[PDB]
Tab-separated table of C-alpha atoms and ligand atoms in Angstrom:
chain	number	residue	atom	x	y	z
X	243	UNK	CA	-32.611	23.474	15.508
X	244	UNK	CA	-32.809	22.657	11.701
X	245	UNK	CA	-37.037	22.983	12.125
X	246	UNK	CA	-39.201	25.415	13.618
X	247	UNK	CA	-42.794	24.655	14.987
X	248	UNK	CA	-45.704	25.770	12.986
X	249	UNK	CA	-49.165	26.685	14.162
X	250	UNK	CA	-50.716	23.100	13.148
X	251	UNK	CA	-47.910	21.365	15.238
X	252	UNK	CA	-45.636	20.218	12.273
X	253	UNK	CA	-42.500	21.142	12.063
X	254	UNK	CA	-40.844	23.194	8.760
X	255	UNK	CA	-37.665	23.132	7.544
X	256	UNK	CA	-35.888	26.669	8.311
X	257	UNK	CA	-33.992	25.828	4.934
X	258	UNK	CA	-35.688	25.362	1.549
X	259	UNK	CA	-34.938	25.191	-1.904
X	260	UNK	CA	-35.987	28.018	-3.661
X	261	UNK	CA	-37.415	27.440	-7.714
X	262	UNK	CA	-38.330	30.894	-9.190
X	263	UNK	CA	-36.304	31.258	-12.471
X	264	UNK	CA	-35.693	27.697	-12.069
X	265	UNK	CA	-35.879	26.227	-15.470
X	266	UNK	CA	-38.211	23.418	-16.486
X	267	UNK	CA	-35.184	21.676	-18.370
X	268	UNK	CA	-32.440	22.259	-14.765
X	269	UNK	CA	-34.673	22.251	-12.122
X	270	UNK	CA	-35.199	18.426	-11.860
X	271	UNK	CA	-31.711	17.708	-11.121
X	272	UNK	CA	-31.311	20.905	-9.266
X	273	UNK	CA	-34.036	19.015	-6.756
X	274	UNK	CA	-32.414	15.570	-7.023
X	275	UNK	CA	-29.431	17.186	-5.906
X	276	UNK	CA	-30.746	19.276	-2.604
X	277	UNK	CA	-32.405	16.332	-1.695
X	278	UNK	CA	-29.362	13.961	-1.697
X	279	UNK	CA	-27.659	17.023	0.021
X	280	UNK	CA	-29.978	17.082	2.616
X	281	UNK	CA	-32.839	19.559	1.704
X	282	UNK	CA	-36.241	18.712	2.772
X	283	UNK	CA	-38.091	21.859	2.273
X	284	UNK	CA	-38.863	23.089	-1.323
X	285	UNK	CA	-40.516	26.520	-2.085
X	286	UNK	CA	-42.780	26.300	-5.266
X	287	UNK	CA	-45.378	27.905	-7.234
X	288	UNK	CA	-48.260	27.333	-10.242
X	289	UNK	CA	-46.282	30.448	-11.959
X	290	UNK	CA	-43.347	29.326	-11.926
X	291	UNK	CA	-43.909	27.281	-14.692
X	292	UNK	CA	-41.959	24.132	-13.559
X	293	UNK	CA	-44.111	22.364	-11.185
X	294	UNK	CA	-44.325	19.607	-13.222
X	295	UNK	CA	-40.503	19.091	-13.312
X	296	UNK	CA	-40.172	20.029	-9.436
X	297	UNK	CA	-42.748	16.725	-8.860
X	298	UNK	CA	-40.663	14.420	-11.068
X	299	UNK	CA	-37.515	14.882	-8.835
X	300	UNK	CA	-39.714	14.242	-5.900
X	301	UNK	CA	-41.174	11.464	-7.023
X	302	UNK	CA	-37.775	9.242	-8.551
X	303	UNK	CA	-36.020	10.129	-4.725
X	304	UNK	CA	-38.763	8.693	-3.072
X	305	UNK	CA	-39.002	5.600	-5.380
X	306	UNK	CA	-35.011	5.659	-5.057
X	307	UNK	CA	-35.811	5.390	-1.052
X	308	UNK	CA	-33.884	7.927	-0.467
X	309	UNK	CA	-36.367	10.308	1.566
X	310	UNK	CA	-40.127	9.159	2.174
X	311	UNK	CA	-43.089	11.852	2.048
X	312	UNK	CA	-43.807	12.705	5.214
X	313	UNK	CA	-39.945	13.843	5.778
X	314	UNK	CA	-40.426	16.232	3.242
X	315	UNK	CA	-41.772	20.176	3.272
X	316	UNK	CA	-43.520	20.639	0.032
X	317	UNK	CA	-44.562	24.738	-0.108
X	318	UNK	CA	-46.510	25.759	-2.836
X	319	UNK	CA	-48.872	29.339	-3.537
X	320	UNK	CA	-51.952	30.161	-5.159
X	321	UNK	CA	-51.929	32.284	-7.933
X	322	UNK	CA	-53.322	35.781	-8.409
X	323	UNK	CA	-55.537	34.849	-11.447
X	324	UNK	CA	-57.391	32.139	-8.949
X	325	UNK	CA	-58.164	34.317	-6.067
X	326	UNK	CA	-62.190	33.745	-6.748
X	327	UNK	CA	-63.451	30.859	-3.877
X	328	UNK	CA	-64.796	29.286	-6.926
X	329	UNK	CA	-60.921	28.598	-8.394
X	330	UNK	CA	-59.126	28.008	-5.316
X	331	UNK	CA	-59.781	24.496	-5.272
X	332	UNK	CA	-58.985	23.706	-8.699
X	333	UNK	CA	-55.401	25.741	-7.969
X	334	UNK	CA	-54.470	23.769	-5.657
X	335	UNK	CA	-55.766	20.217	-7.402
X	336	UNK	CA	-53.447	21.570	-10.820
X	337	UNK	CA	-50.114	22.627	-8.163
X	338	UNK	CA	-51.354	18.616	-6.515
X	339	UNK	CA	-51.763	17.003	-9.752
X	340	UNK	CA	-48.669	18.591	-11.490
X	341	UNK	CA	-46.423	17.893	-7.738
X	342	UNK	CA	-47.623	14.151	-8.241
X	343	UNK	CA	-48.471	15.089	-4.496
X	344	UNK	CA	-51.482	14.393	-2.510
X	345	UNK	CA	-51.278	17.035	-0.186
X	346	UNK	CA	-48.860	19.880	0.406
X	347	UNK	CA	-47.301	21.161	3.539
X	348	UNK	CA	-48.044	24.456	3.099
X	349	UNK	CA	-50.052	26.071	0.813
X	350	UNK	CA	-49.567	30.180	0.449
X	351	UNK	CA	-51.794	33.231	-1.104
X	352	UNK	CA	-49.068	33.803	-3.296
X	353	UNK	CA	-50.026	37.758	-3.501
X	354	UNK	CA	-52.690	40.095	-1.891
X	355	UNK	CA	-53.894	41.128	-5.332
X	356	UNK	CA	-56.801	39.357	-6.855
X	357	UNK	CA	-55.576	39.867	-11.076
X	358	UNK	CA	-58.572	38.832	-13.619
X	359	UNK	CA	-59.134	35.378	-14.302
X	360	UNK	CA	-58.064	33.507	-17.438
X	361	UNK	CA	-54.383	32.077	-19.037
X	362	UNK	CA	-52.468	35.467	-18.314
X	363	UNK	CA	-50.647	35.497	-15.647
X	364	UNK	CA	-50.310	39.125	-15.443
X	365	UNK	CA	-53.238	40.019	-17.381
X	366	UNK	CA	-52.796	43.536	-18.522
X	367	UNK	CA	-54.893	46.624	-19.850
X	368	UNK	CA	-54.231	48.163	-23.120
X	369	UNK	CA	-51.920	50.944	-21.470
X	370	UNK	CA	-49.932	48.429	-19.036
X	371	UNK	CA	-52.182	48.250	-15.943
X	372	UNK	CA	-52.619	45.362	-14.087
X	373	UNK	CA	-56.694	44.174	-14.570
X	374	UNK	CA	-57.851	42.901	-10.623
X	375	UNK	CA	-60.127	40.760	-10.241
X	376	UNK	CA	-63.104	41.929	-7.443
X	377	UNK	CA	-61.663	39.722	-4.906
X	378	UNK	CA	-60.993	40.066	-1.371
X	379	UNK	CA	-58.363	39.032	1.099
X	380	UNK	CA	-61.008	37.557	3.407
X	381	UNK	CA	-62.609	35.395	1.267
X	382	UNK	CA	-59.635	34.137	-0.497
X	383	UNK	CA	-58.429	32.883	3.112
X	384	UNK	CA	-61.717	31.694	3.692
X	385	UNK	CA	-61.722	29.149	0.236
X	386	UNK	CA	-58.109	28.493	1.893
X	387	UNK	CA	-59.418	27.641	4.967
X	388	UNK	CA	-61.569	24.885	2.952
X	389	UNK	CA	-58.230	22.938	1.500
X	390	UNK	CA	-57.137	22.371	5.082
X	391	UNK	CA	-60.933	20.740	5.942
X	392	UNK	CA	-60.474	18.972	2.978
X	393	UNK	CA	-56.795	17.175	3.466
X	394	UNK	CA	-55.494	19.013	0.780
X	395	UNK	CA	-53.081	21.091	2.466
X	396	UNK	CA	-51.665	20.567	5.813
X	397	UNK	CA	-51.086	24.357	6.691
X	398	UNK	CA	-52.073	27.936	5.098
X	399	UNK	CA	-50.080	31.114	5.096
X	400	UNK	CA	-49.787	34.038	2.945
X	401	UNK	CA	-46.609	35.863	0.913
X	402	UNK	CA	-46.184	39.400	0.663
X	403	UNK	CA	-48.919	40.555	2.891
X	404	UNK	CA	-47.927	44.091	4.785
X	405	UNK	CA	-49.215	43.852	8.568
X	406	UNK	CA	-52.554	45.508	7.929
X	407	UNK	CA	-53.680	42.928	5.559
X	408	UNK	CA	-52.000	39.939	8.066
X	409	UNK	CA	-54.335	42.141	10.870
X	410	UNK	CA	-57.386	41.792	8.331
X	411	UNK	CA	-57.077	37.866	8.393
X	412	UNK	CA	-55.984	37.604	12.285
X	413	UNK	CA	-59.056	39.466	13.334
X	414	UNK	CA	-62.210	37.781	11.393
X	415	UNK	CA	-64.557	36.960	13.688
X	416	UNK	CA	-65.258	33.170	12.736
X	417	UNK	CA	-61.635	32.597	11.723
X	418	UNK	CA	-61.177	28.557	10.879
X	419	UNK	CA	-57.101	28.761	11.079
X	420	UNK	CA	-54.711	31.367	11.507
X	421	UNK	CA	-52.095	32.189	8.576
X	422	UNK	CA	-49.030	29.818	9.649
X	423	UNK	CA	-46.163	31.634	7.553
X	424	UNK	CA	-45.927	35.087	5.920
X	425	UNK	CA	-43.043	34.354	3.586
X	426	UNK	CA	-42.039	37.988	2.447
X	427	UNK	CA	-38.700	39.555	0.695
X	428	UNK	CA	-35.701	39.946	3.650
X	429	UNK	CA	-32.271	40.427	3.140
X	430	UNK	CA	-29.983	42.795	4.308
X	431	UNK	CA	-30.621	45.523	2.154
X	432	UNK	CA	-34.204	45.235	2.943
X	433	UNK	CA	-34.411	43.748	6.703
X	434	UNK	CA	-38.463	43.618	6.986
X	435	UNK	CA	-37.436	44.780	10.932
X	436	UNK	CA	-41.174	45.927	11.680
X	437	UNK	CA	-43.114	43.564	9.763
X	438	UNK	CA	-40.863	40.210	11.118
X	439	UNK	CA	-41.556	42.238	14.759
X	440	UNK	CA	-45.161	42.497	13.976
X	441	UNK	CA	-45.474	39.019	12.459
X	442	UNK	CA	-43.384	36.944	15.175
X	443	UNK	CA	-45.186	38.629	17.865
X	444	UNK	CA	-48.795	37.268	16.572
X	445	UNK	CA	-46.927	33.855	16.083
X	446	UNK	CA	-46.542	33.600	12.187
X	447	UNK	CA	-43.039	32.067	10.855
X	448	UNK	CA	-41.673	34.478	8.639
X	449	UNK	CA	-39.894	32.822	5.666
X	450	UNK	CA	-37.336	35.085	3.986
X	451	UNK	CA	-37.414	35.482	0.263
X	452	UNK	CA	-34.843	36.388	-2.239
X	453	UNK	CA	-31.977	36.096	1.017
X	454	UNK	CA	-29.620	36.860	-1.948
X	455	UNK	CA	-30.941	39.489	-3.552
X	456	UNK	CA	-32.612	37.909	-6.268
X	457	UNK	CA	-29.404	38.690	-9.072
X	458	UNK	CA	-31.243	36.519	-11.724
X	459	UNK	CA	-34.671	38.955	-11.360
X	460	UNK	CA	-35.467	39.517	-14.834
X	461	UNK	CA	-35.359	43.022	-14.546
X	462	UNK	CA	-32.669	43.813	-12.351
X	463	UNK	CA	-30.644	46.887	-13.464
X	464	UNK	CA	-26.564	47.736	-13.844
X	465	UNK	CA	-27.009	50.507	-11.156
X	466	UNK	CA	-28.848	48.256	-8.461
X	467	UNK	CA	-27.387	47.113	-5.579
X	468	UNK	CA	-25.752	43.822	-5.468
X	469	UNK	CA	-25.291	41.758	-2.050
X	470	UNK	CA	-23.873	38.752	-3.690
X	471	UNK	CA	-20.762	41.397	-4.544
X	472	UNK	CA	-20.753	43.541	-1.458
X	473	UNK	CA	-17.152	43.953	-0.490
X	474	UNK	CA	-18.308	44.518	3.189
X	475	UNK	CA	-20.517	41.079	3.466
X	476	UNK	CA	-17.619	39.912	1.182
X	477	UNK	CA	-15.334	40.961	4.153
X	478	UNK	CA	-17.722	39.203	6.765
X	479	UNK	CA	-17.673	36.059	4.897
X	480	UNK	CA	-13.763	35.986	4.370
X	481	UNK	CA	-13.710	36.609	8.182
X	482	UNK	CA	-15.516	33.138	8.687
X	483	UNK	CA	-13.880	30.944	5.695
X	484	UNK	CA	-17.588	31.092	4.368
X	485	UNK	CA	-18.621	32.616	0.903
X	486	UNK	CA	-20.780	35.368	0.769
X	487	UNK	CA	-23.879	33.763	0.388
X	488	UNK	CA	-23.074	31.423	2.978
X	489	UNK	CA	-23.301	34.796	4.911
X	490	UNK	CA	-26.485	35.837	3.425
X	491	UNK	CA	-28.411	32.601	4.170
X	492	UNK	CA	-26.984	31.886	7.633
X	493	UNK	CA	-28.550	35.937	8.334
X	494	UNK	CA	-32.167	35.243	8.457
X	495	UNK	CA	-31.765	32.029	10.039
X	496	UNK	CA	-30.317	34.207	13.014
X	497	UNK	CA	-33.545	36.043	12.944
X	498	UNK	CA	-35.626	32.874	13.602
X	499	UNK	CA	-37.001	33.105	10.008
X	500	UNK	CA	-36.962	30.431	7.193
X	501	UNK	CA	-35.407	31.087	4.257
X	502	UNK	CA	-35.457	29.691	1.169
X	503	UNK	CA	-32.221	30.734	-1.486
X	504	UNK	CA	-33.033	29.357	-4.891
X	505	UNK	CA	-30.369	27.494	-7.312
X	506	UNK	CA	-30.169	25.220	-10.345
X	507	UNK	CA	-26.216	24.872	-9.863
X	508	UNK	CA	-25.287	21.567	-8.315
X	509	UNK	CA	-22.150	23.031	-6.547
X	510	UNK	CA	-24.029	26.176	-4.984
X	511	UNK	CA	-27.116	24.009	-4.096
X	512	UNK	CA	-24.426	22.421	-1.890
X	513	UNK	CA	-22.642	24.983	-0.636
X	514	UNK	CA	-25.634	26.897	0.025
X	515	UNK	CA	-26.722	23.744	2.857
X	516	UNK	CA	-23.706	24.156	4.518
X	517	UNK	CA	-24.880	27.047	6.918
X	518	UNK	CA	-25.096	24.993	9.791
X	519	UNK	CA	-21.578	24.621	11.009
X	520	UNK	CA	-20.968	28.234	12.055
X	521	UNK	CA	-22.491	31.675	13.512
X	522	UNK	CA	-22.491	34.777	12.934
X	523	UNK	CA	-21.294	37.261	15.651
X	524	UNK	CA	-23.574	39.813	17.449
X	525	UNK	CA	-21.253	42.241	15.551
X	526	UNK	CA	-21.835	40.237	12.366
X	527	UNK	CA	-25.380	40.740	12.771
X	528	UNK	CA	-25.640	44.135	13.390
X	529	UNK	CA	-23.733	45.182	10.879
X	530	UNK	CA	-25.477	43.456	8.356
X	531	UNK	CA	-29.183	44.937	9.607
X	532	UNK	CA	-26.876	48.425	9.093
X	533	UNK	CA	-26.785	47.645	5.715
X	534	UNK	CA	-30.915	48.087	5.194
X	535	UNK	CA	-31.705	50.695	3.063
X	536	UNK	CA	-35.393	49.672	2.163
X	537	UNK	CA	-34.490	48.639	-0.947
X	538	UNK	CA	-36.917	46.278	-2.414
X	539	UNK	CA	-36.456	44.240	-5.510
X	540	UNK	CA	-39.966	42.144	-5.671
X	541	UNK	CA	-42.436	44.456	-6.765
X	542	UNK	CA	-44.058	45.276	-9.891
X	543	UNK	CA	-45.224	48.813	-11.069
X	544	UNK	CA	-47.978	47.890	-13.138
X	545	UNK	CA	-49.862	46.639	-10.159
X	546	UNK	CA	-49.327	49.454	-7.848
X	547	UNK	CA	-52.649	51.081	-8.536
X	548	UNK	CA	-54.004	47.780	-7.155
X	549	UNK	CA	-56.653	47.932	-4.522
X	550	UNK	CA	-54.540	45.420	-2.307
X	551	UNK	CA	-50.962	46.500	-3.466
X	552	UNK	CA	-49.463	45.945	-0.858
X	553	UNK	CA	-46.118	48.244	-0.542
X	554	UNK	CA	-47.900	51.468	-0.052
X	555	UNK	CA	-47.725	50.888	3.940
X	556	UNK	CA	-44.797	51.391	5.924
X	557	UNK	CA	-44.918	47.793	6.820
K	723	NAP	N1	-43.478	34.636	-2.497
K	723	NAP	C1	-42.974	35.407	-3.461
K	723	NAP	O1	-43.580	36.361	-3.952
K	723	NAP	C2	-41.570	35.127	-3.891
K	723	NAP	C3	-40.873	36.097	-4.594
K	723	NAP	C4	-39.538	35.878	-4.905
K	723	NAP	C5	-38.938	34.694	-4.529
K	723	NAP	N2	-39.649	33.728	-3.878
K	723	NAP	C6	-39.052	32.427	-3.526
K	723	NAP	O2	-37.765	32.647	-2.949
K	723	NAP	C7	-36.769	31.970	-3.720
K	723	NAP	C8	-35.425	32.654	-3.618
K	723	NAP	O3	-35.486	33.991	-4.130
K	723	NAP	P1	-34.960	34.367	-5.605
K	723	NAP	O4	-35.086	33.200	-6.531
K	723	NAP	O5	-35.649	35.638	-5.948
K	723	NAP	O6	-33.418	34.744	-5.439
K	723	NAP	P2	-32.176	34.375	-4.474
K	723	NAP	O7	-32.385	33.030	-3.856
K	723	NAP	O8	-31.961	35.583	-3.625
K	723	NAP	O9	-30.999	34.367	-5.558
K	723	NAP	C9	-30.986	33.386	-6.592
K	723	NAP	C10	-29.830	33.723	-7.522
K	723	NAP	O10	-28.588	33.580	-6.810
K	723	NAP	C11	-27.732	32.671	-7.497
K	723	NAP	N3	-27.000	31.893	-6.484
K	723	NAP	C12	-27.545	30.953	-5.682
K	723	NAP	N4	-26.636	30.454	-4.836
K	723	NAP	C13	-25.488	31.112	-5.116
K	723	NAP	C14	-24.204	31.026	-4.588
K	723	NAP	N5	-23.897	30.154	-3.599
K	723	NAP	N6	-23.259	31.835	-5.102
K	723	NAP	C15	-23.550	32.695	-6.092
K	723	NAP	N7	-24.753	32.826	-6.648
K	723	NAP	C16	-25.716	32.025	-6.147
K	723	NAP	C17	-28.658	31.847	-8.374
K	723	NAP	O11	-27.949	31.360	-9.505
K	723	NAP	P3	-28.147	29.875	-10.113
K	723	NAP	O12	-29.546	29.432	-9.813
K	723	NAP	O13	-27.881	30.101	-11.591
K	723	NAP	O14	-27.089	29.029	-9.437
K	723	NAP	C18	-29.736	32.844	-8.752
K	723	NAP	O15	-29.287	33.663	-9.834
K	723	NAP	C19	-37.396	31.898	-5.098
K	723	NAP	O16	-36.738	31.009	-5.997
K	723	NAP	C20	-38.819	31.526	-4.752
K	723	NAP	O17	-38.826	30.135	-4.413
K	723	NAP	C21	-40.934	33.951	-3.555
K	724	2X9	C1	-42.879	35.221	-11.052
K	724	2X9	C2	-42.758	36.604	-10.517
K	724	2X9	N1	-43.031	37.605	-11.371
K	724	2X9	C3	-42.985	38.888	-10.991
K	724	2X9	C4	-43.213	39.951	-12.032
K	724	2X9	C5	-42.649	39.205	-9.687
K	724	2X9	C6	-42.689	40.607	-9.169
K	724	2X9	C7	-44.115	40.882	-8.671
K	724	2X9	N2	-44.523	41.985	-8.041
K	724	2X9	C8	-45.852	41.948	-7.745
K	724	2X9	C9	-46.595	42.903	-7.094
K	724	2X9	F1	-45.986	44.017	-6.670
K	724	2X9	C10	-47.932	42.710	-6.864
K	724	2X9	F2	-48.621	43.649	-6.212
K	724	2X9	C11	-48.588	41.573	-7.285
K	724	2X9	C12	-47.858	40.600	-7.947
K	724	2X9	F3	-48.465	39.486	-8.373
K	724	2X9	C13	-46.488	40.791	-8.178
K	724	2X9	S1	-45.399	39.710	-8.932
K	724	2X9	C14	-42.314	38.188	-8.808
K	724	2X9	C15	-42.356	36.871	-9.218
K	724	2X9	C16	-42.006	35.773	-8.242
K	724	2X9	C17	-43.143	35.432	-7.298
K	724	2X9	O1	-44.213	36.080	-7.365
K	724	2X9	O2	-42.920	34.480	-6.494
């Protein structure tokens, strides 16, 4: 099944375009493109920077008649710097207003981390600490909860929660709506086993994040691991006349997650769709969760001494 059944009774694309790194002068053709190619679901996000140009793709396909609204997925995520119940709103109305939308699908806490408010995205001390904001994971779900009264958002969720902050949401007494989605980092260097255990079992949809590794992470180093060039997934792929990250999207999908691989290159937004015209083998996917070695590429050091950083825990 190309969908899977959310907790509000829509349905989600399991594939989605991802747009981090996406550039504001590529990524509007790099969205005209999945679209005529068949995406439906697009991850996005106020810091990306390219909302705007995301929206204007949307919006000449559907006056082109190609797709209407409501067969769409739109995904977006609230920024750390708006994590006050007195900014939520106005988050959402700039990701709306810049979208050309008038709702999204989903709608995520984009981090657990409240970060002080004003234009910084990462605003920073004078030594290279993170400033939080006193927020709290409760009652930034609760100002979410408020979107979904209002018609804003169809669904909530949250992105890179570990399961104790997930268990902090699930178990508020007065609770409006459960999250819908955790969408966290998965691939097969990092497999998320316990936390996609922990999450399915509660029934949240897991979307997997950087699938390939993320190569285009601005600070990725010469000595990291790279899946993308793995000779053994490499091997795997060759195996099943797919390319490699063929392999590495088809993976999670195996898993019952979503996943969303991001590109801004007409032929790989392509090839990238094609993942529905094979399987992988039980062999294929064990030896892929082999290659885990808890090796996480999303993260950033000047926020670990963060209250709600959340990579401390196991899981
Ligand atoms: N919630 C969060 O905190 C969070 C964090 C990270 C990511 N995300 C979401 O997840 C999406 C995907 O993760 P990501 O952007 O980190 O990385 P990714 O999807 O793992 O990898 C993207 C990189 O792979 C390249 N690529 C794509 N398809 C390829 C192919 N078929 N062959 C070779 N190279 C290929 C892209 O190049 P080109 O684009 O130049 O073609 C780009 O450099 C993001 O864009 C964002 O939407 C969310
Ligand atoms: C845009 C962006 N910038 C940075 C620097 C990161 C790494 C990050 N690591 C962390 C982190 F550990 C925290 F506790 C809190 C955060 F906001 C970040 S952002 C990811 C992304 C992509 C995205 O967020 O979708």
């Amino acid at each position: 099944a190309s969908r899977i059944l959310l907790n509000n009774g829509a349905k989600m694309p399991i594939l989605g375009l991802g747009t981090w790194k996406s550039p504001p002068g590529q990524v509007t053709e790099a969205v005209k493109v999945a679209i005529d190619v068949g995406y439906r679901h697009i991850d996005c996000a106020h810091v990306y920077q390219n909302e705007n140009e995301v929206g204007v793709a949307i919006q000449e396909k559907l006056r082109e008649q190609v797709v209407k609204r409501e067969e769409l997925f739109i995904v977006s995520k609230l920024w750390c710097t708006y994590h006050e119940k007195g900014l939520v709103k106005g988050a959402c109305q700039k990701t709306l207003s810049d979208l050309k939308l008038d709702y999204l699908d989903l709608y995520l806490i984009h981090w657990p981390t409240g970060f002080k408010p004003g234009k910084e995205f990462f605003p920073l001390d004078e030594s290279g600490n993170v400033v939080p904001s006193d927020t709290n994971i409760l009652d930034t779900w609760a100002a979410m909860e408020e979107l979904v009264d209002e018609g804003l958002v169809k669904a909530i969720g949250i992105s890179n929660f570990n399961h104790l902050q997930v268990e902090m949401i699930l178990n508020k007494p007065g609770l409006k709506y459960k999250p819908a989605v955790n969408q966290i980092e998965c691939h097969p260097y990092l497999t998320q086993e316990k936390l996609i255990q922990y999450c399915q079992s509660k029934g949240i949809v897991v979307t997997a994040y950087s699938p390939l590794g993320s190569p285009d992470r601005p600070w990725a180093k010469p000595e990291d691991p790279s899946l993308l060039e793995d000779p053994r997934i490499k091997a795997i792929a060759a195996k099943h006349n797919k390319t490699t990250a063929q392999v590495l999207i088809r993976f999670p999908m195996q898993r019952n997650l979503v996943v969303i691989p991001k590109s801004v290159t007409p032929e790989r937004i392509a090839e990238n769709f094609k993942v529905f015209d094979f399987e992988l083998s039980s062999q294929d996917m064990t030896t892929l969760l082999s290659y885990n070695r808890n090796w996480r590429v999303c993260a950033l050091l000047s926020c670990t001494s963060h209250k709600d950083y959340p990579f401390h825990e196991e899981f």
